[PDB]
């Protein structure tokens, strides 16, 4: 049973879905379950009581949204089962889980219990013929067509940098933080309350993400932007009430570089990139500096790559060619590589079959991934 396999690119922010051997994912929607706050007195209302995908995006105001995954670690397992069921259902894929093999994704250095419980869901509740779990960095390099590359990614949950060299992922050189797009959006919300405009509800939270996506930029020199007085640019809500953002637009993404702003001493994006290259072997460093690949949504800020270059120039050894590459399709880079990996004939050997899972259990899944 070797049908056209499915590529479920997981993530706390957005969940991409579709079939193998495609250019772009057809089914992209945000990873959250929406349930109504209010009472439904009047008949002919929105049925189901559980809202996932474009219905939830359309009807935010009703729904008390709650994210099942935080930092690539599913907290609420019932909510992810409903989302994965919604992905497979007639509203998106229009196919059964029994037909196609599954390509799952996870962030590196995650809890092994979550990986086991993920496999349990796909093998038992859904009846998958074969499952395979993979990393974000390996898939990003598949999409570009390279083998050598440091993959500095920045999603909604996790930021990390896996240094791969000619098809050799070094597991001990991996640097990871739990500071990313969601924490920047949460940090922007806190600033907007200090400015004046308060947002508190979960439906109301996604307005702050939309402000962060649209009107934010990274200053090349933050001390210079502090000393100077900002212009105070405007933004229109779905309501229509105007919001003067002020200095919070440039100070919000500084959480990525200075994680001491949230009050949680970590490395930072630029330090993680340097530390990943430094932890690897001596002869591999110059090739890893030349091949720096970007991916994820929190790399899309204005002047992000310019500042990320300047920080590498400050930290790294002098007179070395730094090249921070970044494709046009950064958001779907991880899905594209999964679709390419799924289309290859070697894919049949790498996966974990249902029969192999029933015999061995979790140990066989831990062996095949690494």
């Amino acid at each position: 049973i070797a049908n056209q396999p499915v590529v479920i690119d997981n993530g706390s922010g957005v969940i991409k879905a579709g079939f193998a051997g495609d250019q772009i994912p057809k089914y992209c929607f945000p990873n959250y379950v929406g349930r109504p706050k209010h009472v439904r007195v009047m008949a002919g209302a929105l049925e189901g009581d559980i809202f996932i995908g474009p219905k939830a995006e359309e009807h935010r105001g009703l729904l008390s949204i709650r994210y099942p995954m935080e930092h690539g670690i599913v907290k609420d397992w019932n909510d992810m089962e409903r989302i994965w069921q919604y992905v497979y259902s007639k509203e998106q894929l229009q196919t059964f889980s029994e037909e196609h093999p599954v390509l799952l994704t996870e962030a590196p250095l995650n809890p092994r219990k979550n990986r086991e419980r993920a496999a349990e869901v796909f093998f038992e509740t859904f009846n998958v013929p074969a499952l395979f779990i993979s990393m974000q960095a390996v898939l990003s390099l598949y999409a570009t067509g390279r083998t050598t590359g440091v993959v500095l990614d920045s999603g909604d949950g996790v930021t990390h940098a896996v240094p791969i060299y000619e098809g050799f992922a070094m597991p001990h050189s991996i640097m990871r933080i739990d500071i990313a797009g969601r924490d920047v959006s949460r940090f922007l919300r806190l600033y907007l309350r200090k400015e004046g405009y308060d947002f508190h509800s979960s439906s109301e939270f996604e307005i702050v993400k939309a402000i962060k996506e649209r009107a934010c930029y990274l200053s090349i020199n933050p001390q210079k932007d502090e000393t100077l007085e900002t212009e105070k640019a405007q933004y229109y809500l779905p309501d229509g009430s105007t919001i003067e953002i002020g200095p919070s637009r440039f100070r919000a993404p500084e959480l990525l570089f200075r994680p001491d702003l949230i009050g949680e001493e970590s490395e930072g994006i630029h330090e993680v990139l340097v530390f990943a290259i430094q932890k690897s072997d001596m002869d591999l460093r110059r090739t890893l500096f030349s091949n720096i690949v970007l991916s994820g949504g929190s790399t899309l800020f204005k002047g992000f790559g310019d500042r990320l270059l300047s920080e590498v120039k400050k930290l790294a050894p002098k007179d070395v060619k730094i090249r921070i590459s970044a494709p046009q399709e950064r958001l779907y880079s991880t899905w594209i590589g999964g679709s390419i990996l799924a289309s290859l004939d070697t894919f049949k050997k790498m996966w974990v079959s249902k029969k192999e899972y029933e015999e061995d259990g979790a140990r066989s899944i831990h062996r095949k991934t690494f």
């Binding site: 772009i24 992209c28 996506e213 007179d319 070395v320 090249r323 921070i324 970044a326």
Partner: peptide
């Protein structure tokens, strides 16, 4: 190509100049 989010005029990469 089709889909909601893209960035126009960032470029593929930012590279330092190669010396002799």
């Amino acid at each position: 190509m089709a889909d909601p989010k893209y960035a126009d005029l960032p470029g593929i990469a930012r590279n330092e100049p190669d010396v002799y």
